[PDB]
Enzyme design. Structure first.
Site, short mmCIF file in Angstrom:
data_model
loop_
_atom_site.label_atom_id
_atom_site.label_comp_id
_atom_site.label_asym_id
_atom_site.label_seq_id
_atom_site.Cartn_x
_atom_site.Cartn_y
_atom_site.Cartn_z
N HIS A 61 0.83 -1.23 0.00
CA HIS A 61 0.00 0.00 0.00
C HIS A 61 0.85 1.26 0.00
O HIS A 61 0.31 2.31 -0.38
CB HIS A 61 -0.96 -0.02 1.18
CG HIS A 61 -1.83 -1.22 1.25
ND1 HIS A 61 -2.84 -1.44 0.35
CD2 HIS A 61 -1.86 -2.23 2.14
CE1 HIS A 61 -3.45 -2.57 0.64
NE2 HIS A 61 -2.87 -3.07 1.76
N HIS A 91 5.65 6.95 6.18
CA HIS A 91 5.33 6.42 4.83
C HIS A 91 4.78 7.56 3.99
O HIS A 91 4.62 8.69 4.47
CB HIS A 91 4.31 5.26 4.98
CG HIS A 91 3.00 5.72 5.55
ND1 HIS A 91 2.74 5.73 6.89
CD2 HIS A 91 1.93 6.30 4.97
CE1 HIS A 91 1.54 6.30 7.08
NE2 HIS A 91 1.01 6.67 5.92
N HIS A 93 2.10 8.87 0.48
CA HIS A 93 0.96 8.69 -0.46
C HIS A 93 1.27 9.54 -1.66
O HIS A 93 1.77 10.67 -1.47
CB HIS A 93 -0.36 9.12 0.20
CG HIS A 93 -0.67 8.39 1.47
ND1 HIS A 93 -1.36 7.22 1.53
CD2 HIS A 93 -0.33 8.67 2.75
CE1 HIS A 93 -1.43 6.80 2.79
NE2 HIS A 93 -0.82 7.70 3.58
N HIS A 116 3.63 10.97 5.93
CA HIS A 116 2.98 10.78 7.24
C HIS A 116 4.00 10.20 8.21
O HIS A 116 4.51 9.08 7.98
CB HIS A 116 1.81 9.82 7.10
CG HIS A 116 0.66 10.45 6.41
ND1 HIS A 116 -0.38 9.72 5.86
CD2 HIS A 116 0.39 11.77 6.20
CE1 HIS A 116 -1.23 10.58 5.34
NE2 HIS A 116 -0.79 11.84 5.52
N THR A 197 -6.30 4.58 6.16
CA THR A 197 -6.48 3.25 5.57
C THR A 197 -7.25 2.42 6.57
O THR A 197 -7.24 2.70 7.77
CB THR A 197 -5.15 2.54 5.23
OG1 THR A 197 -4.47 2.23 6.44
CG2 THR A 197 -4.27 3.38 4.34
#
Ligand SMILES: CCC(=O)N(c1ccccc1)C1CCN(CCc2ccc(S(N)(=O)=O)cc2)CC1
Ligand SMILES: [Zn+2]
Length: 259
Positions: A61, A91, A93, A116, A197
């Site tokens: 993801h 991580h 996005h 994040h 998520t």
């Protein structure tokens, strides 16, 4: 049973996790003129050590850097928070194309990526997963990324992405200082929200920094080289791994600054 594709993406997550339609969901569109200047907030301090990183992982993801969190060495404190929250992982996005990719938006504007930094209340809870259940359990610092000049410290990270291109792969990643991915301003917006998520728990104090960082287009490109898929499967590139803005439902967005 969830992802970011046509059939398993964010508009369908509620079929698995009904809290997807809750009152405290993230991300949001921050309407900067509607945020409340909150001078009672304490200064935000990101007190990060240089050699607490462990590994870099493609979890299917995102790409995620994990930290040693066995003590309160690498913490966020101040701003909206009651006491220190230890850094667990960071991580990203990002988008398929350069005009999308962030989770939060500001006055309807998206950035190409969002970082994040995920922290937990280890003073109060036993485990990260216990904290992730609780309204006061997590604190996530969000940093927007724009494209522009090359970011020197980001090179270490983007050079490591080859070895984690496939889902489920990991590499050692020592002496990465997450302070290197911060802007020079500590101004922020803050609101009560959720994981973005599954399981979408309403456990996050969001702290979204006002000032983006810059990385080069080449660097942003290395993220788009990652795959959602394992070594043997037909390649699907990891892109558009973001949840779009959710309803505010009467929550107060506070700002550390006057716009
Ligand atoms: C033992 C089971 C278990 O530990 N988990 C679990 C697994 C399946 C089902 C339910 C819970 C957890 C795994 C980690 N997860 C949180 C990860 C996460 C997600 C989004 C962000 S963001 N984008 O908002 O910053 C930050 C962090 C909490 C639940
Ligand atoms: Zn995230």
């Amino acid at each position: 049973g969830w992802g970011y594709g046509q059939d398993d993406g964010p508009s369908h997550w509620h079929k698995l996790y009904p809290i997807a339609q809750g009152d405290r969901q993230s991300p949001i569109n921050i309407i900067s003129s509607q945020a409340v200047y909150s001078p009672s907030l304490q200064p935000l301090e990101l007190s990060y050590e240089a050699c607490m990183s462990l590994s870099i992982t493609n979890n299917g993801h995102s790409v995620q850097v994990d930290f040693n969190d066995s003590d309160d060495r690498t913490v966020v404190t101040g701003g909206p928070l009651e006491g220190p929250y230890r850094l667990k992982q960071f991580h990203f996005h990002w988008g398929k194309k350069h005009d999308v990719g962030s989770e939060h938006t500001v006055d309807g504007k998206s950035f190409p990526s969002e970082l994040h930094l995920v922290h937990w209340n280890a003073k109060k809870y036993s485990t990260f997963g216990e904290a992730a259940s609780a309204p006061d359990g997590l604190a996530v610092v969000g940093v927007f990324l724009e494209t522009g000049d090359e970011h020197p410290s980001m090179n270490r990270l983007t050079d490591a992405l080859y070895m984690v291109r496939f889902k489920g792969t990991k590499a050692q990643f020592s002496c990465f200082n997450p302070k290197s991915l911060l802007p020079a301003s500590r101004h922020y917006w803050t609101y009560p929200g959720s994981l973005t998520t599954p399981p979408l728990s309403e456990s996050v104090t969001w702290i979204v920094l006002r000032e983006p960082i810059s990385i080069s287009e080449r660097q942003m490109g290395k993220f788009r080289s990652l795959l959602f898929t394992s070594e043997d499967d037909e390649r699907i590139h990891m892109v558009n791994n973001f949840r779009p803005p959710q309803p505010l439902k009467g929550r107060v967005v506070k700002a550390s600054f006057r716009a």
